[PDB]
Design a protein around this nucleic acid. Structure first.
Length: 74
DNA sequence: CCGTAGGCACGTCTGCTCGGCTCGAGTGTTCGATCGCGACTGAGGACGAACGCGCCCCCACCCCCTTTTATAGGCGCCCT
C-alpha cells in the first residue's frame, strides 16, 4: 500500500492503462480512488470464503447427480 | 427302641445403603485483538516578494545658418 501511494498519480494512471482498467476510472483520477483501484487490480474475503464453500458443494452435488443416474455399462 | 419331624446352620439371592469416582456446569481471570485518536507526511493551492522586461525619455553628435575670395559653365527671371 505504501509504494502504491508513492506511485505519484501519473505513473498510477499509466499502470491502470497497462492493466486494462476502463478509461472512466483513469479519467476521473481522484488519486486515492486510483490507488485503491490499482491495489484491487493487483489483488485480482469472507464473501469469497462462503462462495468457495458453495462452489465446492455445487460441484460434487452435480457430479453425484450425474454418476448415480447414469445408465452407462462399466 | 426305632422312625420321623423339627430346629439349626449354611448357601444363595436380592435389597438396601454407603463410599468412591467421574463428569458437567459455572465463574473468575488473563491474554490477545481491535478500535480510536493523534501525529507525521505528502500534495496542492494561494499569496507575497524579488527580478527582469518593456517603454519612454533624455542625451549626444553632426550638420545648418553666413562671409569671403578668386574663377567659369549652365539655368532662369526682369525690365528695355
Amino acid at each position: 500500500d505504501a509504494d502504491l501511494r508513492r506511485l505519484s498519480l501519473k505513473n498510477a494512471k499509466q499502470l491502470l492503462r497497462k492493466f486494462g482498467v476502463p478509461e472512466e476510472e483513469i479519467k476521473k483520477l481522484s488519486r486515492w480512488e486510483v490507488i485503491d483501484v490499482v491495489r484491487t487490480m493487483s489483488t485480482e474475503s469472507v464473501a469469497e470464503h462462503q462462495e468457495r464453500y458453495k462452489e465446492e458443494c455445487q460441484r460434487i452435488f452435480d457430479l453425484q447427480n450425474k454418476v448415480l443416474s447414469s445408465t452407462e455399462v462399466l
